[PDB]
Amino acid sequence: SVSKANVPKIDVSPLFGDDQAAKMRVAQQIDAASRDTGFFYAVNHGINVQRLSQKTKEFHMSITPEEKWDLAIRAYNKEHQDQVRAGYYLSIPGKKAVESFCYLNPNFTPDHPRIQAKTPTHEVNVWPDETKHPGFQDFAEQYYWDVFGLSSALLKGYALALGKEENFFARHFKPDDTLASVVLIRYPYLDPYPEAAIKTAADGTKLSFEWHEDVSLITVLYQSNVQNLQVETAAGYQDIEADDTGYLINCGSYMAHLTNNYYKAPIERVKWVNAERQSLPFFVNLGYDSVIDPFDPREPNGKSDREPLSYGDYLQNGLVSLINKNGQT
Ligand SMILES: CC(C)[C@@H](NC(=O)[C@H](CS)NC(=O)CCC[C@H](N)C(=O)O)C(=O)O
Ligand SMILES: [Fe+3]
């Protein structure tokens, strides 16, 4: 029936250090994984993922219907026209099981020039009442910077893996302008589970979210210990093993663009599982004006004829296209 994807566990801790040869050995493993199924687990990453899943659980289970409307993105609340990305994504009982909360760069404030200029994809985060969710905002903002630091190191590994200097990507990944987002996703246990919330794939598999390529440079994902993800290969979809201690890493379609598809953006989908679980992606996005010059590591001269793509326009297009294809989450 369904085979299992080879998803190696890569000790990424050398990427935080100054042992350059050890960094290269990590880079080789990243290269191999990126050329195989496109996924690896980053282990020995230094993030307290036990507290992450705890603080997230407390929030999802304690937020009330009134608070969800008050935080809701524009897709669920016409009063909130500035909330395209950040805020609460409501479930629809009987129809849509998943619900989630998305937040962006905490440095996006009314003082920020991109907020002042009303540049697309930049928004000021919305937060629940502190007294109703003590410590939640503090946890969430600190987590953003914790995973930012992990992601910076991973980007050093990807750069070395492609034959570049280690800051080739990370130099565009900055706290003052990153469009990176965290999404705290709840997938509920439901009895009965509404069939309307289950999609059926071409191959018959029941899904919660259909196939797609990630809109990101890379995706840095923590999930609770419930197997659900699949990656498409030429021989069909393969199950990605769960690992609630590691971070599941893959390239997004911006990486595929700039490498001339040498590191493809894998096609992934989410199987339907009737189980309470958490999915907490960090989408590594660059700045709105960031441009990486494409190259082709397959060619002796490394030359690509692909257009340099401004990251902001890429992100705007990608997020709207994904909603159109796979629905409003
Ligand atoms: C597969 C997981 C990463 C997760 N899927 C997801 O997060 C899916 C597919 S990558 N991503 C999205 O819908 C895009 C969210 C973008 C976010 N609101 C933003 O403004 O930056 C899931 O569990 O459904
Ligand atoms: Fe995805």
Curated annotation (Swiss-Prot):
- Respond yes or no to whether keyword Metal-binding is given for this record: yes
Site annotation Transition state stabilizer: residues: F209
**Cellular compartments per GO CC:** cytosol
A Gene Ontology biological process term: penicillin biosynthetic process
One GO term in the molecular function aspect is: iron ion binding
Q: Binding positions for isopenicillin N?
A: R85, Y89, S181, Y187, S279
- Which residues are 2-oxoglutarate-binding? R277
Top-level enzyme category: oxidoreductase
Fe2OG dioxygenase domain sequence ranges: 174-286
Q: Which SUPFAM superfamilies match?
A: Clavaminate synthase-like (SSF51197)
What cofactor does its activity depend on? Fe(2+)
Q: What is the effect of changing P281 to A/I/V?
A: Strongly reduced the catalytic activity
| Record's catalysed reaction(s) | N-[(5S)-5-amino-5-carboxypentanoyl]-L-cysteinyl-D-valine + O2 = isopenicillin N + 2 H2O
Q: Which UniProt keywords apply?
A: Antibiotic biosynthesis, Cytoplasm, Iron, Metal-binding, Oxidoreductase, Vitamin C
**Which N-terminal stretch is annotated as signal sequence?**
none
Give the note describing cofactor binding and stoichiometry. Answer: Binds 1 Fe(2+) ion per subunit.
Name the Pfam families on file.
Answer: 2OG-FeII_Oxy (PF03171), DIOX_N (PF14226)
Q: Where in the cell is it found?
A: Cytoplasm, Cytosol
Binding-site list for N-[(5S)-5-amino-5-carboxypentanoyl]-L-cysteinyl-D-valine: R85, Y89, S181, Y187, H212, D214, S279
Subunit arrangement? Monomer.
The family annotation for this protein states: Belongs to the iron/ascorbate-dependent oxidoreductase family.
This protein's name: Isopenicillin N synthase
Could you tell me which species this protein originates from? Emericella nidulans (strain FGSC A4 / ATCC 38163 / CBS 112.46 / NRRL 194 / M139) (Aspergillus nidulans)
Name the gene that codes for it: ipnA
